[PDB]
């Protein structure tokens, strides 16, 4: 019972690439902005759940385990996707192709402006580290498996180890030396520390808007929310 372990580095890359979710669209006061973001985030969750299944090793897990990993890391994956979409738009966040926002634009919702800065700082970090899409979809999957594995789990760490092999392989092909290979590996995985912190700072803001009831939130986005309490 392996399935995902028998793959090569190339087959791992193509699997994650072909499974990548699409870039959705959207149709500024506090309620106006927070309403669009809520609408957009609700539609992105649905596609992510399909992306989760088409990740090697994920379908091998039980239903409860899949639910666990997604409930803990849904906001991170939403952010790292948002971060990478706006990677070549410095000082701007690309929530949608027809929805690009700036720092001062986010201040229309207080508490959200802080999350903007971290989101921008991460995309700037990716832009400055010259993150690749192949490297990205790996980080995307690492978060899915790692962010909650502590909360035969042995299999997940086997898959995590194999995803790591992909990055090393991805960097080896790029002509990076042995030293630069594990150095870039460290830099990429340390962003996931930041990305995690963003989610927690982001998960806190959403709960505020829930209790504020200013923005009617999707009940799907609710069951994903109160799973952190």
């Amino acid at each position: 019972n392996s399935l995902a372990l028998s793959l090569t580095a190339d087959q791992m890359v193509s699997a994650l690439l072909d499974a990548e979710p699409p870039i959705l669209y959207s149709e500024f006061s506090e309620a106006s902005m927070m309403g669009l973001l809520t609408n957009l985030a609700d539609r992105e969750l649905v596609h992510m759940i399909n992306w989760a299944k088409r990740v090697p090793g994920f379908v091998d897990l039980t239903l409860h385990d899949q639910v666990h990993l997604l409930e803990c890391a849904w906001l991170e994956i939403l952010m790292i996707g948002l971060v990478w979409r706006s990677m070549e738009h410095p000082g701007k966040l690309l929530f949608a192709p027809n929805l690009l926002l700036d720092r001062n634009q986010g201040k229309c919702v207080e508490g959200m402006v802080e999350i903007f800065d971290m989101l921008l700082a991460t995309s700037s970090r990716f832009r400055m580290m010259n993150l690749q899409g192949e490297e990205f979809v790996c980080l995307k999957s690492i978060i899915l498996l790692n962010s909650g594995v502590y909360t035969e789990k042995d299999h997940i760490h086997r898959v995590l180890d194999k995803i790591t092999d992909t990055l090393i392989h991805l960097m080896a092909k790029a002509g990076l030396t042995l030293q630069q290979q594990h150095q870039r590996l460290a830099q990429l995985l340390l962003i996931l520390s930041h990305i995690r912190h963003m989610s927690n700072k982001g998960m806190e803001h959403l709960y505020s808007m829930k209790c504020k009831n200013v923005v009617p939130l999707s009940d799907l986005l609710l069951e994903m929310l109160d799973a952190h309490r």
Partner: peptide, 10 residues
């Protein structure tokens, strides 16, 4: 319940 269960099955 959880809507997440439904989507992971469909």
């Amino acid at each position: 319940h959880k809507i997440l269960h439904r989507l992971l099955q469909d």
